[PDB]
Design a protein around this ligand. Sequence first.
Ligand SMILES: [Zn+2]
Ligand SMILES: [Zn+2]
Length: 80
Amino acid sequence: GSSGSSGPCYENKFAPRCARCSKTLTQGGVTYRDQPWHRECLVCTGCQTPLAGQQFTSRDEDPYCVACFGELFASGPSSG
Ligand SMILES: [Zn+2]
Ligand SMILES: [Zn+2]
């Protein structure tokens, strides 16, 4: 397995791309954490729900919906 004399140079940023897939965002879209995200992609990291323009919070670098935020981290008080 040996190869060389390869590796072109092509790169042009004309529009924002999903921070997850990094494809393209021309039909508007959304932005999570000062970064472009796919309206569809942008979903809770627990229930997998679209927070597109919804009231939620981020934790440990992950978008979590109020339902999860106050369910995972805010688990039962002094519970096993
Ligand atoms: Zn995406
Ligand atoms: Zn959730």
